[PDB]
Coordinates of C-alpha atoms in Angstrom, one line a residue:
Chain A
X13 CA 11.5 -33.7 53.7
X14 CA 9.2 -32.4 51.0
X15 CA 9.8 -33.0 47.3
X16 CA 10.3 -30.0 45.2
X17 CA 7.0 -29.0 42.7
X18 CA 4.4 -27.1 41.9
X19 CA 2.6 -25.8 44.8
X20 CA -1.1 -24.7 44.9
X21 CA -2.8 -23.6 48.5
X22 CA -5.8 -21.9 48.9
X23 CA -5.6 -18.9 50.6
X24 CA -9.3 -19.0 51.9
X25 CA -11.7 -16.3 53.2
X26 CA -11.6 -13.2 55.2
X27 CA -15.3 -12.2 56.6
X28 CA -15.7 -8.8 58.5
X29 CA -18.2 -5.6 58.5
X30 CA -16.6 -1.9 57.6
X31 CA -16.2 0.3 60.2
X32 CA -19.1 2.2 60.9
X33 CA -19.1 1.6 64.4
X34 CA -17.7 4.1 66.4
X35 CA -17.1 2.7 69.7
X36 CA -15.8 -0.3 68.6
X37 CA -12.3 1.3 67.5
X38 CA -11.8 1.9 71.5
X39 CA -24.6 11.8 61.9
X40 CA -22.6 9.7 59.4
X41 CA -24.2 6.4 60.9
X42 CA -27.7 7.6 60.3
X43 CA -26.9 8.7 56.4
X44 CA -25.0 5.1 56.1
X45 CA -28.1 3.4 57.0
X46 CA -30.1 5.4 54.4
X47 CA -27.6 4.2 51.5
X48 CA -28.6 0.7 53.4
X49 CA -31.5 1.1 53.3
X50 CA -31.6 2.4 49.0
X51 CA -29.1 -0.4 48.9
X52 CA -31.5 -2.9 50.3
X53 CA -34.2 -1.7 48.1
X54 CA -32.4 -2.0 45.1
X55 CA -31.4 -5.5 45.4
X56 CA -34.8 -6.7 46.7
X57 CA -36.3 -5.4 43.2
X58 CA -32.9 -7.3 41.2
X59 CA -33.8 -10.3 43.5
X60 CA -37.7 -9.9 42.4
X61 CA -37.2 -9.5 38.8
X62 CA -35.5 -12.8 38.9
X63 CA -37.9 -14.1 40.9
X64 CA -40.6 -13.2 37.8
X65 CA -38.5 -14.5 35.1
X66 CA -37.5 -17.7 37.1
X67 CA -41.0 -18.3 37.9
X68 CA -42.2 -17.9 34.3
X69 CA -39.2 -20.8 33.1
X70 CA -40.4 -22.7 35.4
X71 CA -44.3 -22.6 34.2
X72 CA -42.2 -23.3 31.0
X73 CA -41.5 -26.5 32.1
X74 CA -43.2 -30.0 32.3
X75 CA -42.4 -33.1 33.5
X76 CA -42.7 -36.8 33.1
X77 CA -43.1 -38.8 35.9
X78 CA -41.0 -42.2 35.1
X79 CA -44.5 -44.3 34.2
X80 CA -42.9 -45.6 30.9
X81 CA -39.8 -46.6 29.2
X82 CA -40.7 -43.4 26.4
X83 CA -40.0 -40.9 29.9
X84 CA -37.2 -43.6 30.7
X85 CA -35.7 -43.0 26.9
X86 CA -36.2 -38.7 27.5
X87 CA -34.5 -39.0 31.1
X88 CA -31.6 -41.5 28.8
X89 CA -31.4 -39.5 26.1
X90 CA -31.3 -36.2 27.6
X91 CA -32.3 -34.2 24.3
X92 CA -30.7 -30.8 23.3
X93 CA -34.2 -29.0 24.0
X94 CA -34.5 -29.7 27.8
X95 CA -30.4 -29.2 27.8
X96 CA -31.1 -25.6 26.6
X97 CA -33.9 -25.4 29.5
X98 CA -32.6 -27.1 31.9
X99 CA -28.9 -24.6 31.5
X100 CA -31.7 -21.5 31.6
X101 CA -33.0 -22.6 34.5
X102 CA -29.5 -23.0 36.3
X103 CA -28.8 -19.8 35.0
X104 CA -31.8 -18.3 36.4
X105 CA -31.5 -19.6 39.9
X106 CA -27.8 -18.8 39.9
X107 CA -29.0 -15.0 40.2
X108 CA -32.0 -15.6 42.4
X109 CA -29.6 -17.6 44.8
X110 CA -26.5 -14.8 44.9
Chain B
X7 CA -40.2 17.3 25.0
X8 CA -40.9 15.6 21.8
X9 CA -37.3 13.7 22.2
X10 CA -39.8 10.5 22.9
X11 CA -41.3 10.0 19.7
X12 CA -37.9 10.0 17.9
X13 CA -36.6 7.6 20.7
X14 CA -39.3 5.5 19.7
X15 CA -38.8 5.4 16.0
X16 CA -35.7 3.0 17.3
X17 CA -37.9 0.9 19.5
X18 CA -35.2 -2.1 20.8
X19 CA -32.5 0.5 21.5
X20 CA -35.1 2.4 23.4
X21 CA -35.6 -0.4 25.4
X22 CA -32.1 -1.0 26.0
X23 CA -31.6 2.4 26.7
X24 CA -34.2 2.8 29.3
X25 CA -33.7 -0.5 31.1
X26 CA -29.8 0.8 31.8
X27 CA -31.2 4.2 32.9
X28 CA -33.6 2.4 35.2
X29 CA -30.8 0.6 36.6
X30 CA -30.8 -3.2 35.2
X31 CA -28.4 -4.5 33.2
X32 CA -30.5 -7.2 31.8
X33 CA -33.0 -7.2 28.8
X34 CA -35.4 -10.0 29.8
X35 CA -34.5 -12.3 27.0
X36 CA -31.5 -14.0 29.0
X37 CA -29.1 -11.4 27.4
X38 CA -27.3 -8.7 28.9
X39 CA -27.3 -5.3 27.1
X40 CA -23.7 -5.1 27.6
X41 CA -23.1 -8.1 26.0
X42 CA -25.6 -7.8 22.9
X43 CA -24.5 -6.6 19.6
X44 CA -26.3 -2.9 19.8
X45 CA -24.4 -1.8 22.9
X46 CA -21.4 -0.1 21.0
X47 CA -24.3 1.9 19.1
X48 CA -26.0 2.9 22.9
X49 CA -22.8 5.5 24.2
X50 CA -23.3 7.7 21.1
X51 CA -27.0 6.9 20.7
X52 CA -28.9 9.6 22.7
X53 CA -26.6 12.2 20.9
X54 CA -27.9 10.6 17.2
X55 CA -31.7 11.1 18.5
X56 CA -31.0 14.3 19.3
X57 CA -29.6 15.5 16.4
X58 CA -32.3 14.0 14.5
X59 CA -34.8 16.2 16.8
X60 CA -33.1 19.4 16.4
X61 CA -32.8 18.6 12.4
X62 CA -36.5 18.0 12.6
X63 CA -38.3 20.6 14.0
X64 CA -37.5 24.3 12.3
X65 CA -36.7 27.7 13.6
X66 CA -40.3 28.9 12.4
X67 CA -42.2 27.7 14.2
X68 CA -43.2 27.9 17.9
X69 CA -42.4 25.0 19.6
X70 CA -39.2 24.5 18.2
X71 CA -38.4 28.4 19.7
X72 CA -39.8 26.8 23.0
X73 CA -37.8 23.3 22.6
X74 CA -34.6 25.4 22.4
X75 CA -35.8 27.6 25.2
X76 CA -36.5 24.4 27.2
X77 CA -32.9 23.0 26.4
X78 CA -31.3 26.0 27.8
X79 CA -33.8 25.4 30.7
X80 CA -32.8 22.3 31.6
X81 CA -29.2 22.9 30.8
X82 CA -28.4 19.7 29.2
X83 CA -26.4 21.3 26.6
X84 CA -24.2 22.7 29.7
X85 CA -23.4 19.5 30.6
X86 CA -22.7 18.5 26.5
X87 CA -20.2 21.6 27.0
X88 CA -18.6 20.5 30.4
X89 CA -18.4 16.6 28.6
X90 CA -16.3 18.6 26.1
X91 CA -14.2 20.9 28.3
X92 CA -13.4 17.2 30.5
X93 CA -13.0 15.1 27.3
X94 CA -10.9 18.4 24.7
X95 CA -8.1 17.1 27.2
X96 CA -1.8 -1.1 25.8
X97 CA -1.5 -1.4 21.7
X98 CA -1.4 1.3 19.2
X99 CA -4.5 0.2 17.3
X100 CA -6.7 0.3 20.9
X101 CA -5.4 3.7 21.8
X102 CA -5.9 5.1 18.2
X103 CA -9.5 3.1 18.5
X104 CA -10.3 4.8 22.0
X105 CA -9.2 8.1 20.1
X106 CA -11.8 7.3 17.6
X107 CA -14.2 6.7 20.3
X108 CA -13.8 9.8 21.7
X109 CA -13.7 11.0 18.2
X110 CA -17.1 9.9 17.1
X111 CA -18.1 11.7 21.0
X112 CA -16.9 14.8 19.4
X113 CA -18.6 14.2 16.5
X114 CA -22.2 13.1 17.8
X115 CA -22.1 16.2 20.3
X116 CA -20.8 18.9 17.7
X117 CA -23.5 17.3 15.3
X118 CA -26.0 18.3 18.0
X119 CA -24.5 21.9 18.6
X120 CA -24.6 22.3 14.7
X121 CA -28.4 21.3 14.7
X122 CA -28.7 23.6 17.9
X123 CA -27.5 26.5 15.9
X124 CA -28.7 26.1 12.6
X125 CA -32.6 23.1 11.9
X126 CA -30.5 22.9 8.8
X127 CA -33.1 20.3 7.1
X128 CA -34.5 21.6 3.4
X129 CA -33.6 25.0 4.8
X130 CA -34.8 34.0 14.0
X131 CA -32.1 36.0 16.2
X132 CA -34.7 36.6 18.9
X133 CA -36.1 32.7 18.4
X134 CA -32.9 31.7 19.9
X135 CA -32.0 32.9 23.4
X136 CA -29.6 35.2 24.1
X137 CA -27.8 33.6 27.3
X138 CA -26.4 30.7 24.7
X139 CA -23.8 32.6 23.0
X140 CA -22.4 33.8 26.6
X141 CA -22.5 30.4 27.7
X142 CA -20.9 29.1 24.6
X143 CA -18.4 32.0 25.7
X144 CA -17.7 30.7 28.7
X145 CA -17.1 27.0 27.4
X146 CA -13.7 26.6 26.1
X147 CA -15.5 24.4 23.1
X148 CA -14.5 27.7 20.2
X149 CA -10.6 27.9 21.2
X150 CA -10.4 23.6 21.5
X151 CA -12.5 23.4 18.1
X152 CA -9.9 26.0 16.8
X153 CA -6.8 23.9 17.9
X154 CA -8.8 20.9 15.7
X155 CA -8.6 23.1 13.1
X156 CA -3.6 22.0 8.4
X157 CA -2.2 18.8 6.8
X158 CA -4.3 16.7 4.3
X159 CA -3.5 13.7 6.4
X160 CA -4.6 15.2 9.2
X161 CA -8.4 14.9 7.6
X162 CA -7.7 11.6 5.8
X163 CA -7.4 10.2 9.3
X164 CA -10.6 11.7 10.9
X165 CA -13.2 12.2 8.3
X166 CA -16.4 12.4 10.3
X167 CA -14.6 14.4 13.2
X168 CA -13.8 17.3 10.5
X169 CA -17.0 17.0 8.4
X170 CA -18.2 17.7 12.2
X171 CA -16.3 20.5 12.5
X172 CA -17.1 22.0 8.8
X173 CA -20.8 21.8 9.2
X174 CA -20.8 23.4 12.8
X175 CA -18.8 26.4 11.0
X176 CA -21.5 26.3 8.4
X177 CA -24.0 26.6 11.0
X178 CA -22.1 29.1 12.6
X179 CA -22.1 30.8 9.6
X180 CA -25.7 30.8 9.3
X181 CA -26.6 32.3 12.8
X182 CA -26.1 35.8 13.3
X183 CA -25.1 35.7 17.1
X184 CA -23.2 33.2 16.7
X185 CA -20.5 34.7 14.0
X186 CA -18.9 37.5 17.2
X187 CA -17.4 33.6 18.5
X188 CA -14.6 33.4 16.2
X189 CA -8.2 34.6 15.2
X190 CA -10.6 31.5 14.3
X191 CA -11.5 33.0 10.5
X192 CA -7.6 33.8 10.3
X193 CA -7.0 29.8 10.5
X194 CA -10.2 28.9 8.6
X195 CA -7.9 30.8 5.9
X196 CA -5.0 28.6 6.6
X197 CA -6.9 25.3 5.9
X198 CA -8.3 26.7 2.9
X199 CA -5.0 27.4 2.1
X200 CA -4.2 24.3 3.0
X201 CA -6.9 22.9 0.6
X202 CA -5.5 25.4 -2.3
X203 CA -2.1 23.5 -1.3
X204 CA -3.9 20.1 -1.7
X205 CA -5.1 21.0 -5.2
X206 CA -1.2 22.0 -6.1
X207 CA -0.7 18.7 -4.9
X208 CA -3.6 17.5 -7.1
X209 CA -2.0 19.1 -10.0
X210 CA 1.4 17.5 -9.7
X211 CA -0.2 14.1 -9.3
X212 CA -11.7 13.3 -2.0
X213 CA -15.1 14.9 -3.1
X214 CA -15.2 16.3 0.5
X215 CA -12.4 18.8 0.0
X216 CA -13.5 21.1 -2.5
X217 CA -16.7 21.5 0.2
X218 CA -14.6 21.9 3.1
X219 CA -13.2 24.9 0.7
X220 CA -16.3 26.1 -0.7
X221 CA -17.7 25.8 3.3
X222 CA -15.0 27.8 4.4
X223 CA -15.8 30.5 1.5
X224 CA -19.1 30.6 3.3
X225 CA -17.9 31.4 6.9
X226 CA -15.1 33.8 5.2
X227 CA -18.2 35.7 3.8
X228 CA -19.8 35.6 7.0
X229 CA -16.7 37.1 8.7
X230 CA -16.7 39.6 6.0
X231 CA -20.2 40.7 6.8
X232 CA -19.5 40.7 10.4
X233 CA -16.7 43.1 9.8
X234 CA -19.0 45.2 7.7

């Protein structure tokens, strides 16, 4: 008894492991877990790098704590300085999160 | 050796350079080095720093008989070949512009085998090793290089591919191992026939023309004294 439009459904997530294992179904392991193992170690230094840089921005930054209405005004205002900051410090933790 | 001091003489594209050949794609200054304005320069760049190294050291003196030496060593210059054997072979403006991509490949790489050959610079058969004329041989770079060798258009649409092509003949020219390679002298005539038909043309009706002719006088005289 649906009306007739436009239809938009997610089609959601599939989460599963490549097969490796070879029991499972019912040496090429070992070599996998070396390429694992490089894999790891290239990502951990990635991760580290932005680990450095996103520690750095945020030595960059300083605060006020909300003891005036001149930190009130900043926190109101929201000026085009901290904007530029604050958007390098999303994009910064954006790669240190994935 | 001594490829890093001319690296350095372009000091950011080194950077970039070496960051990607370390394996991060980021220059520390919230840019991406595929996404800054030098990365269409990068692809061709190691070829341009090359050349400049092989135009800057000469054929006297030792180390540049031992920086040759070392390049057939290393076999870099194998690998130019096999890029040229795998790369000899939607709008119309992209394709032709890949085509010019490519075309600017062949035309960093042959400017490196022409400074290979010849230092050129202002401006010697045993300085350079004999193994690199049999490899050369074996690459199919001379018969593909003689297939882009015949219609004035033809150059009016790549100019830097066949100024490419003219100087590695000229260096060609100069070396004396390297003149048994070219048949490829019989088609150097047509295009300088081809230039002669040009200047009819001219008659009835560039500055790099009369050089491609007067370049191809110079490689007919070397085929003249490699046939006497």
């Amino acid at each position: 008894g649906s009306t007739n439009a436009r239809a938009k459904i997610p089609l959601g997530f599939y989460y599963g492991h490549s097969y490796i294992l070879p029991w499972e179904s019912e040496p090429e392991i070992d070599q996998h877990l070396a390429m694992m193992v490089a894999l790891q170690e290239d990502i951990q230094c990635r991760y580290n790098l932005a680990c450095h840089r996103l520690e750095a921005l945020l030595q960059s930054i300083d605060l006020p704590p909300l003891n005036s209405a001149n930190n009130a005004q900043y926190f109101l205002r929201k000026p085009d300085k901290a904007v530029e900051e604050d958007s390098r410090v999303f994009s910064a933790y954006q790669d240190c999160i994935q | 050796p001594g490829y890093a001091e001319v690296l350095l003489k372009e000091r950011k594209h080194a950077q970039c350079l070496l960051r990607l050949v370390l394996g991060v794609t980021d220059d520390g200054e919230g840019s991406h080095i595929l996404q800054s304005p030098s990365a269409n320069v990068l692809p061709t760049l190691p070829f341009h720093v090359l050349r400049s190294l092989f135009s800057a050291t000469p054929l006297t003196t030792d180390d540049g008989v031992l920086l040759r030496r070392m390049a057939l060593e290393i076999g870099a210059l194998h690998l130019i070949l096999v890029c040229l054997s795998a790369l000899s072979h939607w709008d119309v403006e992209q394709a032709l512009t890949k085509q010019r991509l490519e075309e600017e490949h062949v035309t960093c790489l042959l400017q490196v085998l022409a400074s290979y050959i010849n230092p050129m610079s202002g401006a010697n058969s045993s300085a350079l090793p004999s193994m690199l004329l049999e490899l050369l041989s074996q690459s199919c770079l001379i018969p593909a290089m003689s297939s882009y060798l015949d219609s004035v258009l033809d150059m009016a649409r790549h100019v830097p591919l066949y100024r490419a092509l003219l100087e590695l003949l000229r260096a060609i020219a100069s070396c004396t191992s390297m003149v048994p390679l070219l048949s490829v002298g019989t088609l150097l005539a047509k295009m300088k026939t081809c230039v002669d038909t040009y200047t009819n043309r001219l008659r009835s009706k560039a500055l790099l023309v009369p050089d491609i002719q007067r370049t191809a006088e110079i490689v007919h005289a070397a085929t003249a004294n490699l046939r006497q």
